[PDB]
Design a protein around this ligand. Structure first.
Ligand SMILES: O=C(O)c1ccnc(C(=O)O)c1
Ligand SMILES: O=C(O)c1ccnc(C(=O)O)c1
Ligand code: NI
Ligand code: NI
Lengths: 459, 457
């Protein structure tokens, strides 16, 4: 009933700013490790174990009972949602029968030594949803999760490394973990998940420990890990994942094709003809040419690549990544106050089976419903506000969702995005006319994107 | 019978090297302008007029009589091969009926004021083919052509600029041309053809002249041009086109995705995470941010972009472009000596209705059939020799054609490509066995890619 997790969620309900709620929840997650230290020295660099000394820390997030219930009450499929795996005599086996994962089947596999992995707990647990939806706001990147249930004296998976930053939350029982430094330069901060390794591919762990409930274990993409239950106790953990494909290189991948295009359009030097005869000295068949033009060609290509930096539309790409992040995000979890001050909590009056709202005025005080639900993006000379409030808890079930923002409302919209959580009077919005102030505010409110200082209707 | 064009083609037939032939033909094309001056100062920079003072200069390349004949004897289609166009009352009209362009239809369109434009004369004229096949070898880029026949007192086309470098060869009659400097910075060396312009979009011509037969007019992509026949005389010209999408930027377009990919794979700095909160200070809503992290973000982008050069597979991209060029190329036109010394000129012996006859030997002296017909390209794990000798005179009618070169033949193949036109003994080829020397030479010969010093039969 009353755990540190339930206490901190009650606290978050009272923090008016979504930004401040995200920072606090992250702070709680790694408490008493300071986030400042964590992000400066440890993140993307070191494996980290937080010994919590509190078995109740995470209670309410997820339990085996929740798993059983979801298998029974929801349409959980093998493969798509749940895997059954064993690592036995040095080999990973997958024992997923096809179709629905009923309790009977899942618990038999478990008694046969199979670990069970739930791929999308947030689609089924509202507590995991809330937890992820808040944390994503301070990562700037989708926050996903997997739940792992491993029976006693067993190992579910071959050693591997992931392509995401991982925070292992130990929920029930105990598990012996071994985590390894990237084995080689190319596996440091790996771009994609590893193959299954054998114990012969591995050195000595940088960290080897038995996790107990309440503990946390963080480690970067590229760090090989494996885990096993010792005698008697089963293991249940939740792994929070973020930062899949969120590298400088991913940023450059979107920028360069646009940069080249802009250069070629804006600067005639990029549009000049290649030499007529460069094929006599460039290409595989000429890799040992002594021709001094070869060196001049190589050097010109290098210098032109570097000059491309000037034409890189860094801002438009930050925005595209912002739009993708909106699209990937979980829908928000509203505080009581947010619900009550928005379209979501607007009560309807009923008289003899029929309904009987109240319009916004220039005196209505407003601000964005939350700080991480919307993004203004220029595309093709139009302006669009993309938002998360209609996203599903299933990853990319819904297509990207936006509304057009007209040029005469652009400054008002920017003010609203930039001034959260401060209230602004609709009559103060810097639009051309009074009708524009009202129309913009009403559009945003009716769509679930704005709250008012006092509700617009009452019981 | 005997024009400067026929004389120069006869001369080319005696120049053993295809490279030299190409340079000599280009020299002839702009004579007496030196190519060295042309390529250093004029190319891609200036409109240029060569007043030849010789009406016969181009005789034999193409004529109205050739057009008539090709309409009658070949399957020339409207749209695909020939357009009938008029510029009248300030508008471009296309009067192309669908289907085949018979003489009757084309000459009626002509008499109603239509210019006739032949999109692919080299598909039908063996002299235009030869001319283009030789010149492409000194451009490093497909050489195309169009033929324009414009009736008297008429204009076929709206003013426009092209996306290729143009050399207008005046073949018959006279035409008043007006050429314009790029109107604006973005139209200098333009990347794609212009819309149809009106006379109101245009300034004063940088060059305005009446071309006569023999004359040449060159002008770069981006230069607006138009032309018209005055009283009495019709006009026939051939425009030679090259250098479509052959820019540094096109080269960089193909290199950047590979460069990023190699950098992210080979160097951990490209694999580090972006900041969690960069969206608070980057993006269009933040172009005026005071935030000093915006400045540090920009600097890191610049430093990472500058380092990308080290991971660019410049040779691999040169090769891809070389393969596209092989694919785009016209098939070669062999000299007499080339034909006779290759598989093409090998006679078959017939006895009582059956064929009867040499193998190459380690003593046979060889070199590539021509210098511009083949290219070694590394792709995936493998090595392939792409070649032009099976290309059609129609652009991309044939898909790209290659044969695999096994790793232990690579050096020999390179020596052959790099040492043309010097004869090498098959026994001198730097392979690892005698059998490899022979197999590589035989494969190349049988494919039409090699000639021998003496015929084999
Ligand atoms: O519990 C495991 O066996 C296991 C294996 C691989 N990965 C994870 C994880 O949380 O990443 C857990
Ligand atoms: O002769 C013409 O009207 C004309 C128009 C556009 N282009 C060309 C050409 O030779 O490019 C010629
Ligand atoms: Ni893992
Ligand atoms: Ni033109």
């Amino acid at each position: 009933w009353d755990s540190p997790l339930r206490r901190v969620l009650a606290e978050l309900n009272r923090i008016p700013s979504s930004r401040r709620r995200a920072a606090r929840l992250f702070e709680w997650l790694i408490a008493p490790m300071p986030p400042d230290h964590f992000y400066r020295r440890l993140w993307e660099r070191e494996a980290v174990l937080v010994r919590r000394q509190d078995h109740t820390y995470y209670q309410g997030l997820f339990s085996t009972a929740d798993l059983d219930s979801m298998l029974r009450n929801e349409e959980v499929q093998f493969g798509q949602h749940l895997d059954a795996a064993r690592y036995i005599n040095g080999r990973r086996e997958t024992l997923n029968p096809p179709g629905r994962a009923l309790p009977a089947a899942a618990w038999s596999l478990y008694q046969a030594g199979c670990s069970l992995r739930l791929l999308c707990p947030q689609a089924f647990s509202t507590t995991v949803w809330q937890f992820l939806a808040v944390l994503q706001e301070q990562f700037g990147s989708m926050a996903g999760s997997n739940v792992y249930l491993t029976p006693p004296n067993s190992q579910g998976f071959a050693p591997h490394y992931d392509d995401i930053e991982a925070f292992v939350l130990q929920l029930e029982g105990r598990k012996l973990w071994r985590v390894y430094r990237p084995r080689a330069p190319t596996e440091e901060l790996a771009l994609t998940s590893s193959p299954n390794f054998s114990q012969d591919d591995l050195g000595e762990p940088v960290l080897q420990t038995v996790l107990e409930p309440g503990d946390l274990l963080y480690f970067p993409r590229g760090f090989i890990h494996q885990a096993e239950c010792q005698d008697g106790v089963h293991s249940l953990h939740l792994t929070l994942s973020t930062y899949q494909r969120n590298t400088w290189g991913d940023f450059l991948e979107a920028i360069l094709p646009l940069a080249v295009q802009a250069a070629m359009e804006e600067n005639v030097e990029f549009r000049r003809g290649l030499p007529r005869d460069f094929m006599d000295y460039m290409g595989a068949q000429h890799s040992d040419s002594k021709d001094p033009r070869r060196t001049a060609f190589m050097e010109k290509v290098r210098v032109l690549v570097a000059r491309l930096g000037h034409f890189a539309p860094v801002d438009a790409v930050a925005d595209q990544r912002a739009k993708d992040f909106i699209h990937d995000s979980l829908p928000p979890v509203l505080t009581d106050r947010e619900r009550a001050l928005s379209v979501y909590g607007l009560p309807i009056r009923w008289e003899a089976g029929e309904p009987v709202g109240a319009q916004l005025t220039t005196e209505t005080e407003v601000h964005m419903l939350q700080d991480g639900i919307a993004r203004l993006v220029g595309e093709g000379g139009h302006l669009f506000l993309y938002y998360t409030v209609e996203n599903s808890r299933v990853y990319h079930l819904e297509e990207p969702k936006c509304l057009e923002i007209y040029p005469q409302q652009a400054d008002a919209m920017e003010l609203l995005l930039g001034s959260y959580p401060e209230f602004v009077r609709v009559g103060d919005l810097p639009c051309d006319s009074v009708e524009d102030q009202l129309s913009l505010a009403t559009t945003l409110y009716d769509k679930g994107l704005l709250l008012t200082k006092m509700p617009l209707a009452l019981n």
